[PDB]
């Protein structure tokens, strides 16, 4: 029955790829070759290969012929490590499939569902019958041979996962080293982040206190130190000024007559008739804006500087080594962490005392857990709202009857779908924002935390609220006296197959639609053209109208690694999912290679820091796999424990060993590559000219 | 057991204290005021506790009037942190006892055991009776008020232990900072321990490789790098030469005529007739030993140096901030750790590759767990040996039959107890030796690991003994029932000894005194040997810390279950404070510095004991129908969170020293050649 959904998705993919080819030949930049060459010297630009008389297979050929070195030269290293993630998991699934075929033979040999266990489907229920349900779950009797669909297969998949995870982890460390050593002077090797300075200068100013306290430690090694400020006000004034300047440029571009823009379009004003001569109206607004900004800047740099600062050593060695050293015999003072990118640290979030971060961490996590548990509770009320049918208030009265007889059968269920999907759409941004308040400097750290929270959300959503009951809002009272893990294990063993069919359908769905839209970029194309017909009419505005943005590693890796957990946790239960996971990760490799090589542009560096988290969670997913297989084989009577338990211990040991052998190589950079080959003399002022906040820039 | 154990403890403690006051009058060193005064310029030279007009309470007054700063100025900071541990535990017991008094009242009100729950004494539980069993288990009805044996007392315990652990932890951090600041030029703030130098000198020598690599990283801040060496053979030669030199020192006691001591006397010979003029026999023996040492030392110091080294920077800042960093872009090479004290690092176990350390750790942990489980398995057969009755082959047979009916039947039971004593005596050394195998440089680290191992052993042995009335496939598994009761019986006997006898003997030091006097009467005649005959020995935290924390675990585990035992814990720790103050102020002298690093290892485990308290109390209130959640669930999570809060706020101040407190005010120019002469091994001393 899932063949219908699979066919619908396949048709969607065909339509979207046809649209891509039908559009790629056009003179467009929000599509096939895109913004990235357009700003990078027309490097990846649609040259004679993608120019006139282009190959319909040109994008596929160019993507498949690239190299990891070429990608890391074009885009950031993090893109390379993401591609390594896809490659290594694809290899894992490929070798599992290479061992798959033996498992298929017992699927058609043993015939539990075929044999007398039907009893008319218990005469009161239904479930595993789809002409492939027989071939899935292996339908083995309670004590048959079952060796292949048991400990042997999980041993094989665990060993291959260990081997590829290790090799990929080593390869990512090698890319980190190679890209870190052969770099230029970027303003990170010259700075640190001290952000728990003791507040009182007992009769002095904060900056002098930082200067004294670090001049006592490192003589003859400093440019000078920058202290953080309550920048909120000047930031606000600064976006006011930037918007005023943009609107002035917007007004200036008419070049035909004096423009008069009313205030009704903005909405937060009523000077609609005062639009007259708006082209100069901004000038005094800017004049007032620039005067206020200058006054606030001059006032803020001496008054109420906060208890946190960056520092600037004069040699890469001192900077890269001081950021890992305790600066007080007490720990709650002068906390030091390696400085982040100028474009990746969070001034607003920074300056948070250690205890405040500790409290924020636990309350934010508790809030996330409470939201996950109580998720559907408001949704039920929202669905119950009378919004179902509001025909009584139809003012236009254009075509009332035509919509209430034919299509009304589906919109009634679609409104709860709307209420669900709106929260789904808001969820990534909300999780990102919640991760911000944990204190979390180095925005990439916030992205990683958001990825972790979204992955936990997604697994505890799908695997639970799909397979078993999700509401429990009356049941939670009873579960206080609920029995032990035996009932949960039996429930897993019973409910795995139908959920396996459902996840087959869901992987088909997500695969088809997601990769179709991503490869097409049809939605951003529509937005671009619509805005261009709309507001975008000057060259400055239109250029900003097709900024692609980063890979959004915040929300991509959670989905991909969720589908990884799907691939594992049922890997030998329903060997069908293996081919679907392989095709998902393969097409993901292809499409993401084409995209990240031709459209996307990173906004971080992260120098491969994302990988250890990915490996940690891949291994945790395999651990969940192997525990579930232990339980399932505990149900189907066999030699469970002495088979599975040792390799569960092995998975834990493998995690510890991999951590101990490489994780230390991702936190700090090094001292070797921190001293190696400084040829050009470092600059002094042009280092502040990076970490100075954008708003607080114009100053003596 | 209570009456007999109490009587034995009181009698023996009275006897040993009487012996102390009786023996302290004589001018004996390894006793009341001891070698510890005797060596330090006679600074604490035997005073009114031994001088004219002694007072039996002089030691008590001196101990009570001492100050922590005085101890630190006299003995190492580690003694101060051990005392603050004792004081903190005493304070927790004191607050718990101040809240104890109400809790006893409902125990006298409800008499569950007395009433219908007896059902003809239940036919399944008896033992020694003292009418105080009527207070045990709190004997409350299954669903009465019961708050006293509940959330009230447990919450009070948790609050007082949180407050005390936190305040003490801050106090130890303060002591560490203050002592670490006011220091001198000690060759610890000037070095690191890099011990994963990669294999290849690739056409060169290892020392040149190290020197070039560190000169690339650290220009102008480097003395030179002492590389590790395979000290086995040269260490053996050096100790043999030292023994020969000591034997030569025996000769200057000539005083009658040429000394003549046989080679068979030492044991590794059989020819007595080689006594002739040992004065000369040892000279060319030393001369040959000197030549062999010179050859071996010149060889190993220049040939095939192993893969590990130490470094020496020319500024406390650079050294103390390098040991905390990471050198190579991958961590499996050039591992860097803060250098140990010269006397506290293990050249033997040093130079172990990271994989070998990670595998050895797991193997030794699994082996010690296997021992912790299989403890009784050998002992059953050892008891089963013919040793049970050897009257058949007794050749002398002077008068055994007279005792085999009076008291030797009890000796038939102490023979298995003899087997147990052998294992118990060997166990601390065995655990230390095992911990010395995980790779574990920085001997203090080995002592920490051995203390943890001993503590986990003691818990999972005693508690398994006393879970609940402990006292083809079948003939191996049923031996546990036969073997187990003796383990529990003698371990309770041994902790009963620990309450009183252990402190009594350690304070009196009868055994050290008798060993000293036996050695004095023995061949020891020269002043050097007798002076070295009464080395006091270190504080031995390797066996005192886990025993004390064992009795702490016992104190908590049945604290509110049996509020009676809390006074037993508090009196134990209170008397222990006095005994340890008197000893470590007047006899002991540490062989560490450790600058207070012991304390985290103790705090992490006091919290574990509290956590297991909370778990056990939740379980006990499970059976005793009650609000089994309110008293524990929002508080076990509290303990687990408190662990994180303590760690993430104070842990760092113990692992590393400082930059701020390790940069300030080195007055004179620190010497370079005066640092190697400390890290040079005692074998490779004489050289170019």
DSSP tag of B137: G
Query: Taking the alpha carbons of B117, B119, B121, B122 in that order, is the dihedral positive or negative?
Result: negative
Which residues, listed in sequence order, are joined to residue A310 by a DSSP beta bridge?
A193, A226
CA atoms within 13 A on the CB side of B90: 14
Helix %, strand %, coil % of chain B (to 5): 60, 0, 35
Strand order in the sheet with A305-311: A226-229, A305-311, A192-194, A336-338
| The two structure tokens encoding residue B421 | 């004593």
- A635 touches A645 (CB < 8 A): no
Return all residues near B583 (Cβ < 8 A) that are at least 6 apart: B506, B507
Nearest CB among B324, B657, B660 relative to A324 is that of B324
Which residues, listed in sequence order, are joined to residue A193 by a DSSP beta bridge?
A310, A337
- Ramachandran sector of residue B304 (left: φ over 0; alpha: ψ -120 to 50; beta: rest): left
Burial of A543 (0-12, 13-18, 19+ CB in 10 A): middle
Which residues, listed in sequence order, are joined to residue B526 by a DSSP beta bridge?
none
Q: What gap in Å lies between CA B544 and CA B207, rounded to an integer?
A: 42
- A71 touches A175 (CB < 8 A): no
Helical residues (DSSP H) of A75-201, grouped into ranges: 77-109, 153-181
Burial of B205 (0-12, 13-18, 19+ CB in 10 A): middle
DSSP string, B251-273: GGG-TTS-----TTTTSS---TT
Q: What gap in Å lies between CA B340 and CA A317, rounded to an integer?
A: 25
Q: What gap in Å lies between CA A52 and CA B115, rounded to an integer?
A: 102
Instruction: Answer whether A214 touches B (CB < 8 Å).
Output: no
Cα dist. B290→A335, A590, B234, B286, B686 in Å? Answer: 55, 74, 11, 6, 10
Instruction: Report CB contact under 8 Å: B660, A176.
Output: no
Helix %, strand %, coil % of chain A (to 5): 65, 0, 35
Q: What gap in Å lies between CA A234 and CA B83, rounded to an integer?
A: 55
Instruction: Please count the other Cβ atoms lying within 10 Å of the Cβ belonging to residue A443.
Output: 21
* CA angle, residues A628, A631, A635, in degrees to nearest 5: 135
- B228 touches B350 (CB < 8 A): yes
Helical residues (DSSP H) of A301-407, grouped into ranges: 316-322, 354-373, 376-384, 400-405
| The two structure tokens encoding residue B160 | 């007082």
Q: What gap in Å lies between CA A256 and CA A252, rounded to an integer?
A: 9
DSSP string, A581-646: HHHHHHHHHHHHHHHHHHT---S--GGGTTHHHHHHHHHHHHHHHHHHHHHHHHHS-S--HHHHHH
Query: Taking the alpha carbons of A373, A375, A380, A381 in that order, is the dihedral positive or negative?
Result: positive
Chain A residue with Cα closest to B628: A480
Instruction: Please count the other Cβ atoms lying within 10 Å of the Cβ belonging to residue A628.
Output: 21
Instruction: Report CB contact under 8 Å: B649, A332.
Output: yes
Q: What gap in Å lies between CA A35 and CA A22, rounded to an integer?
A: 19
Phi, psi of A343 (to 5 degrees): -95, 10
Q: What gap in Å lies between CA B151 and CA B99, rounded to an integer?
A: 13
* CA angle, residues A71, A73, A76, in degrees to nearest 5: 75
Residues of A in contact with B661 (CB under 8 A): 328-329
Residues of B in contact with A660 (CB under 8 A): 354, 358
Min Cα distance A228 → chain B (Å) is 22
Chain position carrying tokens 């087959």? A504
Instruction: Answer whether A677 touches B (CB < 8 Å).
Output: no
Q: What gap in Å lies between CA B367 and CA A203, rounded to an integer?
A: 61
Instruction: Answer whether A326 touches B (CB < 8 Å).
Output: yes
| The two structure tokens encoding residue A430 | 């909300």
Helical residues (DSSP H) of A195-315, grouped into ranges: 206-215, 232-252, 278-300
Instruction: Please count the other Cβ atoms lying within 10 Å of the Cβ belonging to residue B393.
Output: 7
Q: What gap in Å lies between CA B15 and CA A634, rounded to an integer?
A: 63
Chain position carrying tokens 């053209």? A529
Cα dist. A670→A188, A665, A667, B322, B331 in Å? Answer: 13, 8, 9, 12, 9
DSSP tag of A682: P
Of B197, B231, B239, which is closest to residue B214 (Cα–Cα)? B197
Phi, psi of B260 (to 5 degrees): -145, 95
- B157 touches B582 (CB < 8 A): no
Could you tell me the resolution of this structure in angstroms? 3.9
- B423 touches B372 (CB < 8 A): no
Instruction: Answer whether A212 touches B (CB < 8 Å).
Output: no
Radius of gyration of chain A (CA): 30
Radius of gyration of chain B (CA): 29
| The two structure tokens encoding residue B192 | 């690191």
Q: What gap in Å lies between CA B195 and CA A142, rounded to an integer?
A: 55
Deposited experimental method: cryo-EM
Q: What gap in Å lies between CA A258 and CA A248, rounded to an integer?
A: 12
Q: What gap in Å lies between CA A494 and CA A503, rounded to an integer?
A: 16
Q: What gap in Å lies between CA A564 and CA A614, rounded to an integer?
A: 11
| The two structure tokens encoding residue B343 | 């006397």
- Ramachandran sector of residue B92 (left: φ over 0; alpha: ψ -120 to 50; beta: rest): alpha
Query: Taking the alpha carbons of A84, A90, A94, A95 in that order, is the dihedral positive or negative?
Result: positive
Q: What gap in Å lies between CA A679 and CA A663, rounded to an integer?
A: 30
Q: What gap in Å lies between CA B520 and CA B518, rounded to an integer?
A: 5
Q: Return the H-helix or E-strand segment holding B338.
A: strand B336-338
- B587 touches B34 (CB < 8 A): yes
DSSP string, A642-669: HHHHHHHHHHHHHHHHHIIIIIHHHHS-
Phi, psi of B646 (to 5 degrees): -65, -50
Cα dist. B146→A329, B131, B424, B626, B636 in Å? Answer: 47, 21, 41, 8, 20
CA atoms within 13 A on the CB side of B203: 0
DSSP tag of A307: E
Q: What gap in Å lies between CA B201 and CA B306, rounded to an integer?
A: 11
Return all residues near A470 (Cβ < 8 A) that are at least 6 apart: A376, A464
DSSP string, B308-334: -EEEE-SSHHHHHHHTTS--SSSTTSS
Of B685, B679, B675, B591, which is closest to residue B342 (Cα–Cα)? B679
Instruction: Report CB contact under 8 Å: B326, A668.
Output: yes
Q: Return the H-helix or E-strand segment holding B573.
A: helix B565-586
Instruction: Report CB contact under 8 Å: A321, B320.
Output: no
| The two structure tokens encoding residue A598 | 């031709």
Q: What gap in Å lies between CA A695 and CA A301, rounded to an integer?
A: 13
Instruction: Please count the other Cβ atoms lying within 10 Å of the Cβ belonging to residue A659.
Output: 14
Q: What gap in Å lies between CA B106 and CA B97, rounded to an integer?
A: 16
Return all residues near B542 (Cβ < 8 A) that are at least 6 apart: B428, B432, B447, B450, B451, B454
Phi, psi of A477 (to 5 degrees): -65, -40
Cα dist. A381→A90, A412, B366 in Å? Answer: 43, 15, 56
Chain position carrying tokens 């002068």? A334
Of B585, B602, B536, B660, which is closest to residue B171 (Cα–Cα)? B602
Q: What gap in Å lies between CA A545 and CA B337, rounded to an integer?
A: 53
State the best of A331, A652, A661 to mutate against chain B, taking most chain B CBs within 10 Å.
A331
Return all residues near B244 (Cβ < 8 A) that are at least 6 apart: B282, B285, B286, B289
DSSP tag of A135: T
Q: What gap in Å lies between CA A99 and CA B661, rounded to an integer?
A: 61
Q: What gap in Å lies between CA A577 and CA A506, rounded to an integer?
A: 11
Phi, psi of A428 (to 5 degrees): -60, -45
Tell me how many helices (H) and strands (E) chain B has. Answer: 25, 4
Q: What gap in Å lies between CA B552 and CA B561, rounded to an integer?
A: 15
Nearest CB among A329, A358, A660 relative to B653 is that of A329
Q: What are the structural domain ranges in chain B?
A: 191-352, 610-654
Instruction: Report CB contact under 8 Å: B358, A657.
Output: yes
Q: What gap in Å lies between CA A174 and CA A673, rounded to an integer?
A: 13
Q: Return the H-helix or E-strand segment holding A92.
A: helix A77-109
Phi, psi of A192 (to 5 degrees): -135, -175
CA atoms within 13 A on the CB side of A198: 12
Instruction: Answer whether A671 touches B (CB < 8 Å).
Output: yes
Cα dist. A232→A229, A298, A304, A456, A693 in Å? Answer: 9, 14, 12, 33, 11
């Amino acid at each position: 029955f899932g063949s219908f959904l699979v066919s619908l998705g396949t048709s969607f993919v065909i339509f979207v790829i046809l649209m891509l080819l039908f559009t790629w030949l056009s003179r467009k930049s929000g599509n096939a070759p895109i913004y990235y060459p357009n700003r990078i010297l027309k490097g990846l630009e649609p040259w004679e290969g993608t120019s006139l008389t282009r190959n319909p297979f040109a994008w596929m050929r160019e993507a498949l012929t690239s190299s990891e070195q070429d990608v890391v030269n074009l885009s950031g290293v993090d893109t390379a490590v993401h591609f390594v993630f896809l490659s290594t998991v694809l290899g894992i699934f490929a070798c599992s499939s290479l061992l798959l075929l033996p498992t298929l033979l017992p699927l058609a040999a043993t015939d539990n569902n075929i044999k007398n266990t039907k009893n008319a489907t218990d005469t009161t229920s239904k479930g595993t019958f789809s002409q492939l349900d027989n071939l899935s779950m292996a339908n083995i009797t309670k004590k048959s041979s079952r060796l292949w669909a048991f400990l042997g297969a999980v041993y094989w998949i665990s060993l291959v996962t260990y081997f590829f995870l290790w090799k990929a982890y080593k390869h990512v460390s090698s890319l980190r080293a190679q890209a870190l050593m052969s770099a230029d002077v970027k303003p990170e090797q010259f700075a640190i982040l001290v952000r728990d300075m003791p507040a009182p200068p007992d009769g002095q100013t904060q900056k002098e206190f930082i200067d004294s306290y670090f001049r006592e430690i490192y003589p003859e090694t400093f440019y000078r130190s920058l202290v953080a400020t309550e920048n909120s006000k000047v930031n606000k004034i600064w976006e006011k000024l930037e918007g005023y300047k943009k609107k002035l440029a917007r007004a200036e571009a008419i070049l035909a007559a004096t423009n008069n823009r009313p205030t009704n379009k903005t909405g937060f004003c009523g000077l609609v008739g005062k639009q007259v001569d708006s082209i100069e109206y901004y000038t005094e607004l800017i004049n007032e804006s620039v005067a206020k900004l200058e006054t606030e800047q001059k006032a803020v740099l001496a008054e109420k500087q906060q208890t946190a600062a960056v520092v600037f050593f004069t040699t890469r060695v001192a900077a890269a080594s001081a950021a890992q050293s305790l600066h007080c015999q007490m720990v709650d003072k002068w906390t030091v962490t390696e400085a982040p990118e100028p474009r990746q640290l969070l001034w607003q979030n920074l300056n948070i005392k250690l205890f405040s971060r500790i409290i924020r961490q636990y309350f934010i996590n508790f809030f996330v857990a409470v939201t996950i548990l109580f998720y559907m509770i408001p949704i039920a009320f929202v669905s119950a709202i009378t919004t179902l049918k509001n025909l009584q208030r139809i003012i236009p009265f254009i075509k009332p009857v035509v919509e209430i007889t034919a299509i009304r059968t589906v919109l009634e269920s679609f409104l709860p779908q709307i209420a669900l999907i709106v929260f789904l759409a808001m969820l990534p941004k909300l999780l990102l924002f919640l991760s911000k308040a944990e204190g979390i400097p180095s925005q990439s750290h916030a992205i990683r935390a958001a990825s972790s929270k979204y992955f936990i959300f997604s697994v505890f959503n799908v695997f639970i609220g799909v397979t078993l009951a999700g509401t429990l809002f009356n049941t939670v009272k009873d579960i206080a006296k609920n029995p032990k893990l035996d009932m949960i294990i039996n429930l897993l063993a019973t409910s795995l197959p139908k959920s396996a069919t459902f996840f087959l359908t869901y992987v088909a769905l997500k695969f088809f639609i997601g990769y179709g839209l991503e490869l097409s970029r049809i939605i951003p194309l529509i937005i671009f053209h619509l805005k261009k017909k709309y507001l975008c009419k000057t060259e400055a505005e239109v250029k900003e109208a097709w900024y692609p943005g980063d890979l959004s590693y915040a929300t991509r890796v959670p989905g991909d690694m969720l589908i990884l957990t799907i691939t594992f946790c049922y890997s030998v239960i329903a060997p069908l999912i293996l081919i679907f996971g392989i095709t998902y990760f393969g097409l993901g490799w292809l499409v993401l290679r084409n995209q990240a090589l031709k459209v996307y542009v990173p906004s971080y560096e992260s120098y491969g820091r994302m990988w250890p988290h990915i490996h940690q969670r891949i291994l945790a997913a395999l651990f969940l796999f192997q525990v579930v297989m232990f339980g399932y084989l505990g149900a189907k009577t066999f030699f469970y424990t002495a088979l599975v338990i040792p390799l569960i211990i092995t998975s834990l040991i493998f995690g510890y060993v991999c951590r101990q052998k490489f994780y230390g190589g991702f936190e700090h950079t090094a001292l070797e590559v921190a001293c190696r080959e400084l040829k050009q003399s470092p600059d002094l002022e042009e280092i502040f000219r990076a970490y100075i906040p954008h708003s607080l820039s114009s100053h003596k």
